[PDB]
Amino acid sequence: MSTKYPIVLVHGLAGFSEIVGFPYFYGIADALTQDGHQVFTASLSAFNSNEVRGKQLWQFVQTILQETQTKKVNFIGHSQGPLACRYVAANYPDSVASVTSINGVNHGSEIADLYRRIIRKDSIPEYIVEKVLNAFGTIISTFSGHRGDPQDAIAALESLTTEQVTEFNNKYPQALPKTPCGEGDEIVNGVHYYCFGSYIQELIAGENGNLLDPTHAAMRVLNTLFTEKQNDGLVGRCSMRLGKLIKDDYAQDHFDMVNQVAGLVSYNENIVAIYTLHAKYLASKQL
Ligand SMILES: [Ca+2]
Ligand SMILES: [Cl-]
């Protein structure tokens, strides 16, 4: 069961593989190709708007469609990636077979909102300020070797705020939940939409691998700062919703759902198998 249309993995941290030394979707393109699927990876700019990432993505896809002569692509995006995918699907539906959003910031990130308030010097209790700053420094240091300037992250997190995703969502409403925390239509203008998510949970005798992953400790701290108690450290469970829900109750953090860092995840969960099973599902729908 390989897909009719090529899979395009989409993320919003262009430069990751060059700076960090391994792919953002850790182990995923390899496993999908072992299974017979055509796989591309689109790495889009972190420091740009969602619209501008969507335009970069279209240029990427137009380019691969010329060569595969396949007409359409199946997008699999994580975090900011789905917003760029949504842009291409809304604009160029005849070129998009599906959009699959994995822990997408589809309605905004409470942590991005909080970081913005910090940079604006709103009155935030200092203990909250330190939790955010220290988690970001730990994440940024784990991947890049430097903790960064806290104004380093601004250009990136701005496009993930509830404000800026709301504005995006007004222009590109396709497949968005109607009800608070609902599902969207599976098919809009011929494009199939699917979503996956996860949230941090205290269950038994994990977390195993993740005990060695500094990003997981950062996510666990960030998790405590949200009004939405079910979240993945960066995005609240309901904010991830787009199109048809597949599964959103994995006990995983935001990074874990891309098998990071370096395959350190909770509970010896096989994250790559989430992606390979989903590819077979897409193929099963003649995509
Ligand atoms: Ca992890
Ligand atoms: Cl990458």
CATH, residue 170: 3.40.50.1820
- Catalytic option among 78, 95, 216, 232: 232
Q: How far is the CA of 17 from the centre of ligand 2 (A)?
A: 5
How many distinct structural domains can be found in the chain? 1
Helix (H, G, I), strand (E, B) or coil at 75: strand
Find out whether 286 and 45 touch, Cβ atoms under 8 Å: no
**Residue from 25, 27, 31 nearest 2 by CA:** 31
Please say if 113 is a catalytic residue: no
Please say if 254 is a catalytic residue: yes
Ligand with the closest atom to the CA of 219? 1
Structure tokens at 74: 């199946």
Structure tokens at 208: 């195993």
Q: How far is the CA of 127 from the centre of ligand 1 (A)?
A: 24
Integer Cα distance of 164 and 176 in angstroms: 15
Ligand with the closest atom to the CA of 212? 1
Structure tokens at 41: 């990876």
* 166-193 CB burial, b ≥16 within 10 A, e <16: eebbeebebbbbeeeeebbbeebeebbb
Q: Provide the residue range defining the domain that includes 68.
A: 1-287
Binding site members for Ca(2+): 51, 210, 213, 256, 260, 264
Q: Which long-range contacts (CB under 8 A, 24 or more apart) does 271-277 make?
A: 272/27, 272/28, 272/31, 273/31, 274/196, 274/247, 274/250, 275/25, 275/28, 275/31, 275/32, 275/76, 276/31, 276/32, 276/35
Strands 73-78, 7-11: pairing kind = parallel
Helices (H), 145-213: 154-158, 162-171
Helix (H, G, I), strand (E, B) or coil at 185: coil
Q: What is the resolution of this structure in A?
A: 1.8
Find out whether 198 and 257 touch, Cβ atoms under 8 Å: yes
Helices (H), the chain: 16-20, 28-34, 50-68, 81-91, 110-119, 126-144, 154-158, 162-171, 214-223, 272-284
